[PDB]
Amino acid sequence: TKGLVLGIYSKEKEEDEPQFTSAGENFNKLVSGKLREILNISGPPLKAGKTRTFYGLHEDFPSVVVVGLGKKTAGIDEQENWHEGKENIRAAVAAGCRQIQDLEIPSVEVDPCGDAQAAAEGAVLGLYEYDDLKQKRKVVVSAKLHGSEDQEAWQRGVLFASGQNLARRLMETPANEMTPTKFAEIVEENLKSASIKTDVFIRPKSWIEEQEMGSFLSVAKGSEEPPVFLEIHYKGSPNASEPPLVFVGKGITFDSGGISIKAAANMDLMRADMGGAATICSAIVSAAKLDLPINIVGLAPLCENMPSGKANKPGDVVRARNGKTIQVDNTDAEGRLILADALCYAHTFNPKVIINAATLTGAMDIALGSGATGVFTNSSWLWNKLFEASIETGDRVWRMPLFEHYTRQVIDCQLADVNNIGKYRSAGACTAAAFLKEFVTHPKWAHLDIAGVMTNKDEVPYLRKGMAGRPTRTLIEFLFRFSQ
Amino acid sequence: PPLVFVGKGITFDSGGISIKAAANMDLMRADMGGAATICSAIVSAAKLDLPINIVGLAPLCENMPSGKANKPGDVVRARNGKTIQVDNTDAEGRLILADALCYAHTFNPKVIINAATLTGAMDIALGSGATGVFTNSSWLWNKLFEASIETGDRVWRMPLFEHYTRQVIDCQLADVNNIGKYRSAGACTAAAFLKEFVTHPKWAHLDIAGVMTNKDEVPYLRKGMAGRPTRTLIEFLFRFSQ
Amino acid sequence: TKGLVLGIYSKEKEEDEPQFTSAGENFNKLVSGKLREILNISGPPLKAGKTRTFYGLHEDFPSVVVVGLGKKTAGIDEQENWHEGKENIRAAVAAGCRQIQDLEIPSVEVDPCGDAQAAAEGAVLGLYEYDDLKQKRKVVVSAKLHGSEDQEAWQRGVLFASGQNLARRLMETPANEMTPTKFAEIVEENLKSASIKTDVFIRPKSWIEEQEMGSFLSVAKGSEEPPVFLEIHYKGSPNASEPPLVFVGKGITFDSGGISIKAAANMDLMRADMGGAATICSAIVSAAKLDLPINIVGLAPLCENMPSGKANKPGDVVRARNGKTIQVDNTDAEGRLILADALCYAHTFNPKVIINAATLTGAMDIALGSGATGVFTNSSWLWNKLFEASIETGDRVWRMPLFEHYTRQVIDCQLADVNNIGKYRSAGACTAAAFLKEFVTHPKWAHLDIAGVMTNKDEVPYLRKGMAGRPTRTLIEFLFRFSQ
Numbered sequence A, C: 001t002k003g004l005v006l007g008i009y010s011k012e013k014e015e016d017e018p019q020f021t022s023a024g025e026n027f028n029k030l031v032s033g034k035l036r037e038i039l040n041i042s043g044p045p046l047k048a049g050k051t052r053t054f055y056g057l058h059e060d061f062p063s064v065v066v067v068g069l070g071k072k073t074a075g076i077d078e079q080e081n082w083h084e085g086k087e088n089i090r091a092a093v094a095a096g097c098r099q100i101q102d103l104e105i106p107s108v109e110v111d112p113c114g115d116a117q118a119a120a121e122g123a124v125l126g127l128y129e130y131d132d133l134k135q136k137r138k139v140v141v142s143a144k145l146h147g148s149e150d151q152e153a154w155q156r157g158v159l160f161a162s163g164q165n166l167a168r169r170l171m172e173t174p175a176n177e178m179t180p181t182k183f184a185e186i187v188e189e190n191l192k193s194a195s196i197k198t199d200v201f202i203r204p205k206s207w208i209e210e211q212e213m214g215s216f217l218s219v220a221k222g223s224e225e226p227p228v229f230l231e232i233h234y235k236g237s238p239n240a241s242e243p244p245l246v247f248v249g250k251g252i253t254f255d256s257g258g259i260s261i262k263a264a265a266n267m268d269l270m271r272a273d274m275g276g277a278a279t280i281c282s283a284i285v286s287a288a289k290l291d292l293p294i295n296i297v298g299l300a301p302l303c304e305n306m307p308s309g310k311a312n313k314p315g316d317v318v319r320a321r322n323g324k325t326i327q328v329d330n331t332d333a334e335g336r337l338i339l340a341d342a343l344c345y346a347h348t349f350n351p352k353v354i355i356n357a358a359t360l361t362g363a364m365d366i367a368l369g370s371g372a373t374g375v376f377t378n379s380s381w382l383w384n385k386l387f388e389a390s391i392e393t394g395d396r397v398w399r400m401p402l403f404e405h406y407t408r409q410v411i412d413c414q415l416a417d418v419n420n421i422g423k424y425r426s427a428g429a430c431t432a433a434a435f436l437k438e439f440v441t442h443p444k445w446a447h448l449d450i451a452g453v454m455t456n457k458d459e460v461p462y463l464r465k466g467m468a469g470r471p472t473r474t475l476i477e478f479l480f481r482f483s484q
Numbered sequence B: 001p002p003l004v005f006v007g008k009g010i011t012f013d014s015g016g017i018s019i020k021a022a023a024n025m026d027l028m029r030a031d032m033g034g035a036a037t038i039c040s041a042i043v044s045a046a047k048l049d050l051p052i053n054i055v056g057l058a059p060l061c062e063n064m065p066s067g068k069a070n071k072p073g074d075v076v077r078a079r080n081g082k083t084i085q086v087d088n089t090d091a092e093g094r095l096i097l098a099d100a101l102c103y104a105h106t107f108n109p110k111v112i113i114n115a116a117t118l119t120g121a122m123d124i125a126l127g128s129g130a131t132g133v134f135t136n137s138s139w140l141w142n143k144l145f146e147a148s149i150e151t152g153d154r155v156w157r158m159p160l161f162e163h164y165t166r167q168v169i170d171c172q173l174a175d176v177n178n179i180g181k182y183r184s185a186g187a188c189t190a191a192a193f194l195k196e197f198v199t200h201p202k203w204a205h206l207d208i209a210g211v212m213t214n215k216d217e218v219p220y221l222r223k224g225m226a227g228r229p230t231r232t233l234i235e236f237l238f239r240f241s242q
């Protein structure tokens, strides 16, 4: 019928037994001490992230899963740059919820564990799974807050997690289904359901050609799938003339590499080469659901990178919207090409800040893996705001260098103004970022390379195996704090 | 109490049984750059007669293939008793450093700083733009960072997260594995491996693989081995003595 | 204190509820129906291989793990060539035992589940783990039969499984510890503890040179680790003159490939390139513990294959004990070289049958993976005996062709009588087997290529991740049936 997830902390030295949360101690009382008695009989105490299931304790809750929360007073961890307490909660709740799902129970009530937003994030992120195309599926579990106190915190958590889950769905979906047009239509419907203060323009190829986006066009032409330039507006500020914050996302729905073709091994993961677009767009949908009082513009060039009789050829020279020429030495370095045009266009909105996200380089994954998103920025103020936000969400960011040293390696070019791959193979993520800087004149610009946090195997406990949707929540948190 | 410096001194790295490719392998004669930089820094500090006690430690050897070489899968015991599964014999720097770092604790040092031309991943990460610094002390990071601003031989901080430690302690046969479960974040997992041999509150690991050579990036250095970041190390010691 | 593992079958159509085993129904009675009541409350029924834990049902058994046994009347599966019932039991019991271990309980009593030997095999194979070199270890669990009926079947199972576990330990152990000498000394002590009717000779290099084993010597010389030729005798027949069954095993303690050097990726697994020697030797130890009334001889050439200033060089020609010359075109095809000499020597015992086992070719893994061991034999009688035995143990065998078509590809040789790698890359396991046949004149010879069943990830439910020790039990079963 209905399941229940309860938390218990690790025992502190001067305590006689590990302490339950408020909901845990109360439940124990409701069942006349039966919960504590059975936990004692079952064996060793529960450590952070571990779970244990007890049956028949109450007629309304035939299955009760107790989860280990770790140390009660865990706050900000200086070594890890995150709030440890929140991370323990998200992981423990996800584990509890999955045990309830394995038991095939359709609904679960969750202990707020001293921080309802984090508990909600663990349940919602933890239970997610993309199974639309399978006949064999797990039971759909409805998770709700146990109790009626602090409902707003719980709901804030569901909102944040739902935002990241949308990014995951968009990324996980096979490319033949998640085409440039389909992605745009899904985002449009999600933003419009979130708020009536929105405008969406799924700009077609003719518009792209009118905007002189020759760099973006050179990439798209190799494929038979039509390209689109997604532009979204969220008018949340009281003053309509208030300059917007602009977000830009790389939307390659599928990257085969083009003529500079990729190796077969694990190339299926390239259906998520639109993760940049998925994360910034989901962040705008959430900000819109939250009705944040700020104006926001989202831009996402979308297309496929395929080999054919009309594809980009190594050595070809293309002209960006701003007139700069680019020598396309490697057709698989296509993200920086489409972003050159999107970033130029971003300046037309005379924005307050410009933030782009992209699953850009294999070098970023080699650099930091899934530990943190790499952030390249010309503004320490901006770096600090993103960093602070990440400490709260736990979806970490780490700063990478924007030095002229790297710019030199991309402007040293045989045929044009700038080369799309550096002279050397060293510092791939840094030279890619340097390339993007040639298309930015704004004082507050940040580039997020999310190639390393594209997927999850088991690094983040509360995310099942698959596309991660990172760092959506950090983006939402940043916008939230910015609006205040 | 002395400040202790540790340097990887592989005079030549062929890779061993997990043999390297021929292309540009000659550059591996500089796989002792860690030892060269910390030792030169101590020589300079000594010429300057800085009023501080300093200890320098450098394990030195060659990594070659032969009838008695390390074999993939072999398990070895570090000075501190921890066991290590040698899955890849070319990840030899972390092996020699495990013992040198354990030994460093015997001097009951104020700080521990090691330098090593450790991973190809560091070069892929930052190239010759800056030396990667992994540290459990923000105070220490700040002192190294400030020094680098003055010398121009830049440093950039890299993450020491438990996330990476998990990938090296997940080991089939022993306490710790000498290469991670995945190929991602090579420099971070190597640093995590080293942390298992450090209990000191002020330790910094400098991966200088990317600043090993100079083609033309640093205008004032001709083509060849760079000797970076020696001056940043000297500046750090100078400021520390004052 | 003490744990209990009980089995339950899947419900048959005309039954009202799934049926417990005899021990399960009795336990339920002891606790006045409390087990059935709690299982009913907990949810969905237990399917094959699944488990569920119940706490506080009895003061002597604070943790009771019920395991799904599948269909009660599962017998020989014609599609799978095995006894399905036994496989369900082994897997279910292993799962139950591991849950008890995770709970950190030092001892468990196990339900015989209608077949005590299979239940014992699941518990013993299931709990095994090589952790001698780790500081962090799981609790040591002592598993015993629940009840006192059919103790001989239970013990037979512990014997068979212990035999396979020894092969696993020998294979898993790092090569710097598991050297040719060390392997020989460990086997010697195990055989001698098993029976006083044994003789072991750890033949040194000088003996190998006297026996004119130039092929085996060419492989060993590249390494600084001394080679040994292990010879073991088990005199179990009442008639000492009774011709022995001879077993031969490839004992490469570490295979780097030599001058024809292997790639770095996963080369650590080559510490198990002595699996052939480990399996035939463990089989002889078990047969000896069982005091089977048959004479058996075990032969295992042991050495390392390393690159150095004195290693085998591609193109070198070496002379086998029987005088045939071999062109060593690829130094990584070293197993067939050492086996040429061991097989020649095997004929000196004027054996009844000759069985060799070897982790010989990557081609065998590509051919059948871990599904079955490949068997090449010139005797259909012998094939049938091995096949029948495998149906009982579940550690399957599959016949591979010994055709002259393959022999032609190895005798077509530029410089010598036979080439150590075929003219073409096709049918690697078949040409390797053809090569071995040139050193065999016996009418009942079987070659077992176990390269594909060297390791286990999760294919065999009851074996944890690591070296598998397959197909030891099939070898023991064969010897058992042969003695009767």
Ligand SMILES: CC(C)C[C@H](N)C(=O)O
Pocket: A255, A273, A332, A333, A334, A335, A359, A360, A361, A362, A451
């Ligand atoms: C690893 C990937 C993120 C590579 C990236 N798709 C590049 O455009 O090919």
Ligand SMILES: CC(C)C[C@H](N)C(=O)O
Pocket: B013, B031, B090, B091, B092, B093, B117, B118, B119, B120, B209
């Ligand atoms: C690129 C190099 C610094 C690699 C490093 N010598 C490792 O031990 O093989």
Ligand SMILES: CC(C)C[C@H](N)C(=O)O
Pocket: C255, C273, C332, C333, C334, C335, C359, C360, C361, C362, C451
């Ligand atoms: C895959 C392996 C079983 C290969 C085998 N060791 C050969 O001698 O190299």
Ligand SMILES: [Zn+2]
Pocket: A170, A171, A172, A173, A174, A175, A178, A253, A271, A272, A274
């Ligand atoms: Zn997709």
Ligand SMILES: [Zn+2]
Pocket: A255, A257, A305, A331, A332, A333, A334, A335
């Ligand atoms: Zn690409």
Ligand SMILES: [Zn+2]
Pocket: A252, A255, A273, A332, A334, A335, A359, A360
């Ligand atoms: Zn791409």
Ligand SMILES: [Zn+2]
Pocket: B013, B015, B063, B089, B090, B091, B092, B093
């Ligand atoms: Zn190396």
Ligand SMILES: [Zn+2]
Pocket: B010, B013, B031, B090, B092, B093, B117, B118
């Ligand atoms: Zn090295």
Ligand SMILES: [Zn+2]
Pocket: C170, C171, C172, C173, C174, C175, C178, C253, C271, C272, C274
């Ligand atoms: Zn071994």
Ligand SMILES: [Zn+2]
Pocket: C255, C257, C305, C331, C332, C333, C334, C335
């Ligand atoms: Zn070989």
Ligand SMILES: [Zn+2]
Pocket: C252, C255, C273, C332, C334, C335, C359, C360
């Ligand atoms: Zn071999």
